[PDB]
C-alpha cells in the first residue's frame, strides 16, 4: 500500500548556481540567472528545484564553506533576489529545496573566529579542539580534501578538526548550544517558505568519543568510519522533533559513507528522521574506496545489482532519490553512457528513461537534459576544484602515482566535469555569460545547447519532457514495485514496474550492436508507451524485441 506524497511523485532539477546563468558579466552564475530561466524548467516539466549553497562564503569549496548562514553569497545576488526566486517559483507552482551545510562552517564564520581566540572563549567548544600528540596531530584522521583532518592553531597550540578543507572546521554537535543555534538558522530559512532541505554529509555530525586512531584497514575507508558516531540518529531525530516536523517540507539526506544496510535508519518514516535517501553505492560503483579519485572497469550486471539492492533497502517504509550525476560526479552520459557523437543522444535518452522509471524521486542535474558531457581537461591547472588539488598533493606530489596516470583517472572522475557552465545556445560562451566564464565552457556547446533542442521534437530535452509527462500519467512508474528480469545480463537492462494488474517493462540496450531479446515466461507486450532509436515495429502480443544499438523503451505488458 503506497503512501503517496508530493515529494515521492516530484521530479527535481538540481541547479548549481555558479554554473547556471550569469546575468551581470562577472563570469559566475547568479540568482537572477535562475529566475530568468524558470520558464525553461517549467517547459521541461520540473516541479521542484534543489539549489546548491547560496550563502555568504569565501568559496574555498564553492559555497560549501559558509561564512554567514543568513546572508546571500555576494556573487549570487541579494536577499531581495532570493525572495524574488521564491516568489517567481511560487507563481509557477514550483517548490524550492535548499542545501543545508551544518557539518562545518567556514573558518571565517563569526563562531569560529571567536572559538579560535582562546580556550576561554564561550564559542570555544562550538568546534573540536584537541592537543597534539608528540608534536604531531591528535590522531591519524585524514581529510577528504587532502592531508590531515587536524589543523594546528598557533594562538592556542591546539589542533582543530576539519574532515573537509582546512577552511571548513567541523561544528561540535555534542554541544547542545550548537544544535540550538543551527535550529534557529533553519527556522530562518524555513520561515521564508522554502519547501525542501538537502542535508550535506548528514551522517558525519556525530564524532567518535575520544578520537582514537584509525586502524590500517580503516584508513583505507575512512568515510565509513566517520559515519560511526554513536549519537547521529539521536541528533537527526532531535532536529526532526524540534524543527523539521513543525514545517511542511521534504528533507533529503546525503548519507555519504553510510553502508547501504544502515541507511534505512535515516529514512524509515516511522523513525521521524529524514524523507529522501541520497545513496552513493550506484554513482560510485566504478570508484576505488581507498584512492577515491581512481576509476575502474564496471559492468551492467554490477550496475543493475546495485539498483536492486538500493531499491530493496528502502523497502516499504523508506524512500530513495535516484540520480546518475550531480555537482560532485562526472556527467551521466559520459560516465554510464557513450558520449561519442554517434551515440551520445541515444545513450542520453536511454539513461533518461532509466532515471524517470525508478521507484524513487528522480533528480535531473542541470544540463543532463541536453546530454552535456565531461569536459576535455588536459593539464592539472585546467581544473578548479579544491578536491582534485588535495588528491594531487597526496598522491602525485608524494611520488606515489605518476602525474599522467593520475590525470587519466581524474579527467574521468573530477567534480569539475559537472561544473562547466550550462550551454544555453550557440552564441559566444554558449550564452552563459557576456564576460569570461569562471570555468571554461565545453567547446561542444555549438553541438549541444538548449536553443538547438527546445523546439526540436527529436531532441534530448524533449525526450526528457516526454518521459516526465509519461511518469506523471502512469502511477506504476512512480510507486510500482521493481523486478529486474536478469541481474546477470551485461547487454540488455530489462525490468518491470508493477501496481496490481498494471505492469510495465523498461528495456535498454547498453550494446552498440543489434540485440535480440526474448521476454521471459508468459510476458507479452500490450502497448508501446515510448521508444527511442527503434526500427522494428512492436505489435500486440509480441514476446521478443529486436533492439537497435542504444535503443530504449517503455512497454505496457498484457495481464
Ligand atoms: O567529493 C566530495 C566529497 O564530499 C561529499 C561529502 O562526503 O560531498 C558534500 O560535502 C562536501 C563538503 O561540504 C562538498 O564539497 C560536496 O559538494 C557536498 O556534496 C561527498 O560527495 C564526497 O565525499
Ligand atoms: Ca554573475
Residue numbers in the entry: 42 to 600
Article, verbatim:
SIases, classified as glycoside hydrolase family 13 (GH13) enzymes, catalyze the isomerization of sucrose to produce isomaltulose and trehalulose as primary products and D-glucose and D-fructose as by-products. NX-5 (named NX-5 in this work) that predominantly produces isomaltulose (~87%). Similar to other GH13 family enzymes, the NX-5 molecule is composed of three domains: the N-domain (residues 42-145 and 216-520), the sub-domain (residues 146-215), and the C-domain (residues 521-600). Among them, residues Asp102, His145, Arg239, His368, Asp369, Glu428, and Arg456 are responsible for sucrose binding and residues Asp241 (the nucleophile) and Glu295 (the acid catalyst) are crucial for sucrose hydrolysis for PalI, MutB, and SmuA.
To investigate the mechanism of substrate binding and sucrose isomerization, we determined the crystal structure of the inactive E295Q mutant in complex with the substrate sucrose at 1.70 Å resolution. In the structure, the sucrose molecule was deeply bound in the active site with the glucosyl ring at subsite -1 and fructosyl moiety at subsite +1. The glucosyl ring of sucrose interacts with a water molecule and eight residues of NX-5 (Asp102, His145, Arg239, Asp241, Gln295, His368, Asp369, and Arg456) via a hydrogen-bond network as well as through π-π stacking with Tyr105 and Phe205. The fructosyl moiety of sucrose binds to NX-5 through direct hydrogen bonds with Gln295, Asp369 and Glu428, hydrophobic interactions with Phe297, and hydrogen bonds between 1’-OH, 3’-OH, 4’-OH, 6’-OH and four water molecules. Therefore, the fructosyl moiety of sucrose has fewer interactions with the active site pocket, which should allow it to exit easily after sucrose hydrolysis and undergo tautomerization resulting in trehalulose production. Upon sucrose binding, the phenyl rings of Phe297 and Phe321 were forced to move away from the substrate. Substrate binding also pushed the side chain of Arg325 towards Arg328. Glu428 is involved in a 2.39 Å hydrogen bond to the 6’-OH of the fructosyl moiety, which induces the O6’-C6’ bond to rotate 98.9°. The most prominent structural differences between NX-5 and MutB occur in the catalytic325RLDRD329 motif and its adjacent 10-residue loop (residues 330-339). The conformation of the 10-residue loop (residues 330-339) in NX-5 was remarkably different from that of the corresponding loop (residues 289-297) in MutB.
